[PDB]
């Protein structure tokens, strides 16, 4: 659901369409995704769900598809 | 599972918020939120010689006098910087805990969670010693929103982190001691004092004082109040050269320097816009708790600053003309919402 | 006939204006002010919104030429932002009593070939009167660009009132009203000797201190330990060497190298200034009849070698070039204190 | 011979071996050479002739092989 969406929006930001986008993939602690990617995720959420204030931008809330999907739902 | 440590866009503010909560003080609502501020700051050419003036620089602050001043005076305590000798560091951390706590400075490279082994960073990092970790090492609070949480460090590693060699940032035994526990009488007065601080800061804001000081780092120019953000935008138009310069492939070391420094000016500004959103959200929580939210109507200065923050992030991440113009429009909107909110609120105080 | 120049453009510009009123700035003003200072900007009392990074540099300027030139000549060295319709009349009025340093962006100065950037700081030039063509003559005081340049009245006014204006150059003049009386002129070397003694006393006094500002805690140290303290502090940027020796870098790692390189570039300009100032002191000491006090000792040469070691390091950031700068600085510090003690004994 | 020495020292610093080098070739104002080449010229002069202080590092003194040779000749006696 949110996860499917999340897993979709991440696809184009992934470094190669050959990268295992599992829900528990580590996106930032691993240097797979960078700030340019984080920007895209923030803009998606601002446009499709509830815009996030600085206090929700935590490595905890964004290091996995699952965590992001969870951040949006809580939000 | 669900994290419980406080955090903020400036790591020292998030650290201070954890220490304030130990002694029954809500930093974001009663101290940051009680201090309504807006200031444009510039470092520029002044009286020769100024050897530390490396570049013309512009930024913004919503911190005003700052939490060290407000927290100290509101609690009747002290927020004191020292460089402690190594043989006194651990005793200082234990003695500070009884009355609040300590901000302990260290290099980025000392904090494994930052993944910065190859650089001490532009400025030193800060953590809050937080008792003994479950394995018997020292527990540390991280106050920056991105990294927020608790970490552990051995006593040996903590002393090595406080006394690095070499020491570019001069972190050697650097502590900020928060001896801030209010008396019972002072505790009962905190919301009364926070209401008085709120009015005093709104009066300073509307007074719109300006100042300038000649230093060996340059002429430091500042402007408070409603025209602070409009003045900031007028000054930032001067960095419109970054957009075409960042877009080129044939960049001299010099031009690459100009772009790196210009991108950093907007990165630093963006963190100040994040702090503004945080501080304005704190003000809205203070006002709500004081039963005054009727007097401000539904104005949302916290949302206008959040939008300005997002515009800043878009711009430093991609320096193009569309992104620069969007930031300026977001800041002009935040200025308008601020002055209307401030005039409406001060009428009810 | 030729234009005077220095490692700092404003100093080269002031030297041209001084020469118009019979003052040898390098010898009688810069050379009369013996100085050595480590300066640091670091974390202090929160909040400090203009503290972007820890910064370390060196100065041999001490009080600086504006202070010494004003009191030695009985004149004034005054900054003004003047309105556009007063600018040309101000330049003419200043020329009668000395001259003007006029600020402009790098991009207004065609010889700098900097059309795409106003640069990190504003530039400065000295208006040197209007030519028959009605064009203004501009003196460039930086050694690299040294020379005289022509600009139309229209281009000069456009240069002085740029839009946008990141550096705040709008009508920014430094007025040098510095023509000594004939009697004060006749005593200039006596005043130079009194200034020489005063700066040497300050140097050996070795005062140090710190001040909190919105741009950070500013830490300074004067005197014989200024350079040893500088070298100890600069060892903290040794992380730049392994970082600069890598073909891959994040935006943050690239910024760290770019800003670290800028720290050593700025420091290298101060070492060039130190070589310039100490050469001035050598000329002053020789004219005063005091070369006999310091035979052998060449602090000008020791700082020239430090300057060259700096240039090598900022051009190629590696461990060897870093060690070489540290050795060159420690040698200048040694020659400076030996020279200063011998010279002050004879004043 | 001094102009010849300067031209020989400069040939290795040029972008390609197909770059033409005359006595009047503009070296720096053209952006043909940068500060890394300037360092090599300073070090050569420092090593073979009279070390140059900051006042001699002018575009006027360094912008052509002829100017460099004249700088070395002026500063050596
Ligand atoms: C969130 C993010 C990682 C995004 O990086 P990008 O680059 O935009 C970055 O903007 C950030 O906020 N980094 C934290 C910097 C920090 O540690 N500050 C605390 C200083 S004590
Ligand atoms: C001599 C040189 C061009 C060499 O450049 P590189 O890069 O090492 C550079 O070091 C320099 O001195 N030029 C800039 C000086 C300048 O314009 N100063 C500002 C004066 S207002």
Most B-contacting residue of A27, A38, A54 (CB-CB within 10 A), to test interface: A54
> Within this chain, do residues C269 and C120 fall inside the same structural domain, yes or no?
no
The resolution in Å comes to: 1.7
Does B248 reside within a domain?
Answer: no
- This structure was determined by X-ray
B174 near C CB under 8 A: yes
DSSP secondary structure letters along C300-344: HHHHHHHHHHHHHHHHS--HHHHHHHHHHHHHHHHHHHHHHHHHH
Chains A and D touch (3+ CB pairs under 8 A): no
Same domain, C188 and C322: yes
Q: Beta strand C216-222 with C123-130: parallel, antiparallel or unpaired?
A: unpaired
Domain membership of residue B26 as a residue range:
1-32+78-179
Find the DSSP H helices in chain C: 9-20, 65-73, 84-95, 153-160, 182-186, 188-205, 226-234, 240-244, 251-288, 299-315, 319-345
In degrees, rounded to 5, the angle at the alpha carbon of residue D39 between the alpha carbons of residues D36 and D45 is 150
- B61 inside domain: no
* Integer Cα distance of D73 and D58 in angstroms: 15
Examine residue C164 and say whether the peptide bond preceding it is cis (omega within 30 degrees of 0). Answer: yes
Domain membership of residue B295 (yes or no) is: no
| B270: Cα separation from own chain's centroid | 11
Q: How far apart are CA C63 and CA C207, in angstroms?
A: 14
**Residue count (chain C):** 347
What CA–CA distance (Å, rounded) separates B279 from B36? 8
The span from the CA of C115 to the CA of B246, in Å, is 15
DSSP annotation of B318: S
Number of structural domains found in chain C: 2
Alpha carbon separation from C32 to B333, C63, C277 (Å, rounded): 55, 11, 9
Q: Given the DSSP bridges, would you call strands C98-104 and C76-81 parallel, antiparallel or unpaired?
A: unpaired
- Of C177, C209, C231, the domain-final residue: C177
Closest to B35 in 3D by CA, of B196, B235, B237: B196
> In sequence order, what DSSP letters do the residues of C1-28 get, joined into one string?
-PPP-BSSHHHHHHHHHHHHTT--IIII
CA atoms lying within 13 Å on the CB side of residue C253 = 15
Contact status, residue B32 vs residue B279, Cβ threshold 8 Å: yes
Distance from C-alpha of D50 to C-alpha of D43, rounded to nearest angstrom: 10
B254 Cα to chain C: minimum distance (Å): 9
Contacts of C275 in chain D (CB under 8 A): 53-54
For B265-300, the DSSP string reads HHHHHHHHHHHHHHHHHHHHHHHHHTT-GGGGTT--
In a domain, C85, yes or no: yes
Q: Are B261 and C120 in contact (CB under 8 A)?
A: yes
**3-state SS, one letter per residue, for B150-202:** EEEECHHHHHHHHCCCCCCCCCCCEEEEEECCCCHHHHHHHHHHHHHHHHHHH
C19 and C140 part of one domain = yes
For residue B313, report the distance from its CA to the centre of ligand 1, in Å. 11
* CA dihedral of B252, B255, B256, B262, whole degrees rounded to 10: 180
Ligand lying closest to the C-alpha of residue C113: 2
CB contact at 8 A, D37 and D11: no
**For chain A, how many structural domains are there in total?**
1
Interface of C with D (CB under 8 A): 5-7, 113, 143-147, 272, 275-276, 279, 300, 304, 307-308, 311-312, 315-316
Measured in angstroms, how far is the CA atom of residue C161 from the centroid of ligand 2?
Answer: 25
H or E element, residue B244: helix B242-246
- Count of Cβ atoms closer than 10 Å to residue D48 Cβ: 11
Residues C195 and C144 reside in one and the same domain: no
Nearest to B192 by CA among B43, B30, B309: B30
Q: Which two tokens stand for residue B262?
A: 């210009």
Distance of CA A69 to CAs A7, A29, A75, C13, Å? Answer: 9, 18, 10, 63
Distance (Å, whole) CA B269 – CA B256:
20
Q: Which residue has the tokens 């063509």?
A: C133
Question: How far does the centroid of ligand 2 lie from the alpha carbon of residue B285, in Å?
Answer: 53
Question: Chain A to chain B, count of Cβ pairs less than 8 Å apart?
Answer: 41
Dihedral sign for Cα atoms in the order B50, B52, B57, B63 = negative
Q: What's the CATH code of the domain at A45?
A: 1.10.1200.10
Q: How many Cα atoms sit within 13 Å of C301 on the Cβ side? A: 8
Residue B67 falls inside a structural domain? no
Q: Are residues C155 and C24 in the same domain?
A: yes
Asked if B47 and B123 touch (Cβ cutoff 8 Å), the reply is: no
From CA C297, how far away is CA C260, in angstroms rounded? 33
Range of the domain at D61: 2-75
> Are C143 and D35 inside 8 Å of each other by CB?
no
- Which of B3, B115, B146 faces A57 most closely, judged by CB atoms? B146
What is the rounded distance in angstroms from the CA atom of residue A57 to the CA atom of residue C257? Answer: 28
Written as one string, the DSSP assignment of B108-140 is: GGG-GGG--TT---SS-EEEEEEEE-TTSSEEE
> How much distance in Å is there from the Cα of D21 to the middle of ligand 1?
50
What 3-state DSSP class applies to C77? strand
Q: How many CB atoms lie within 10 A of CB B106?
A: 24
Closest approach of chain B CAs to the CA of A42, in angstroms? Answer: 9
Binding-site residues of A sit at 35
User: Is the CB of B11 inside a 6 Å radius of any atom of ligand 1?
Assistant: yes
Q: Is the peptide bond before B49 cis (omega within 30 degrees of 0)?
A: yes
Evaluate: CB of C123 within 6 angstroms of ligand 2.
yes
Q: Kindly state whether residues C190 and C278 are assigned to the same domain.
A: yes
Quick one: how many helices (H) and strands (E) in chain B? Answer: 10, 10
Measure Cα distances from C71 to B318, C63, C76, C173, D66 in Å. 51, 12, 8, 20, 45
C277-295 CB burial, b ≥16 within 10 A, e <16? bbbbbbbbbebbebeebbe
- Residue D32: alpha-carbon gap to chain centroid: 12
Structure tokens at C272: 């060039």
DSSP A52: P
Nearest CA in chain B to A53: B306
**SS3 at position B103:** strand
């Amino acid at each position: 659901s949110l996860l499917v969406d999340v897993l979709e929006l991440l696809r184009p930001l992934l470094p190669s369409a050959d990268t295992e986008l599992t829900p528990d993939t580590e996106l930032f602690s691993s240097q797979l995704l960078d700030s340019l990617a984080l920007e895209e995720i923030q803009a998606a959420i601002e446009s499709r769900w509830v815009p996030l204030p600085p206090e929700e931008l935590t490595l905890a809330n964004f290091n996995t598809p699952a965590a992001i999907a969870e951040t949006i739902a809580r939000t | 599972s669900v994290d419980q440590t406080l955090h903020a866009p400036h790591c020292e503010v998030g650290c201070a918020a954890n220490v304030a909560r130990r002694v029954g003080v809500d930093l974001a609502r009663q101290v940051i939120g009680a201090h309504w501020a807006s200031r444009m700051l510039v470092r520029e050419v002044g009286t020769f010689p100024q050897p530390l003036l490396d570049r013309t620089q512009v930024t913004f602050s919503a911190q005003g006098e700052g939490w060290p001043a407000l927290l100290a005076r509101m609690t009747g305590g002290e927020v004191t910087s020292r460089h402690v000798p190594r043989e006194e560091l651990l005793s200082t951390l234990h003695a500070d805990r009884a009355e609040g706590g300590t901000l302990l400075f260290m290099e980025d490279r000392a904090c494994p969670w930052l993944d910065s082994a190859h650089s001490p960073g532009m400025l030193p990092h800060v953590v809050v010693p937080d008792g003994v970790a479950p394995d018997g090492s020292w527990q540390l609070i991280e106050g920056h929103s991105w990294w927020r949480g608790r970490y552990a460090m051995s006593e040996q590693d903590l002393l090595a982190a406080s006394y690095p060699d070499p020491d570019p940032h001069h972190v050697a035994g650097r502590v900020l001691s928060l001896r801030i526990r209010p008396s019972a009488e002072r505790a009962a007065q905190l919301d009364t004092l926070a209401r008085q601080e709120l009015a005093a800061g709104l009066r300073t804001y509307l007074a719109a004082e300006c100042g300038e000081t000649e230093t060996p780092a340059g002429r430091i120019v500042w402007a408070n109040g409603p025209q602070s953000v409009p003045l900031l935008v007028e000054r930032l138009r001067g960095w419109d050269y970054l957009c075409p310069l960042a877009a080129r492939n044939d960049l001299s070391t010099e031009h690459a320097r100009d772009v790196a420094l210009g991108r950093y000016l907007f990165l630093a500004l963006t963190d100040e816009l994040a702090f503004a959103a945080y501080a304005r959200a704190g003000t809205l929580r203070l006002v709500e708790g004081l039963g005054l939210a009727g007097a401000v109507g539904g104005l949302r200065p916290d949302e206008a600053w959040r939008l300005a923050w997002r515009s800043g992030q878009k711009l430093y991440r991609r320096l193009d003309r569309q992104n620069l113009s969007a930031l300026f429009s977001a800041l002009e909107k935040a200025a308008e919402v601020d002055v209307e909110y401030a005039r409406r609120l001060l009428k009810e105080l």
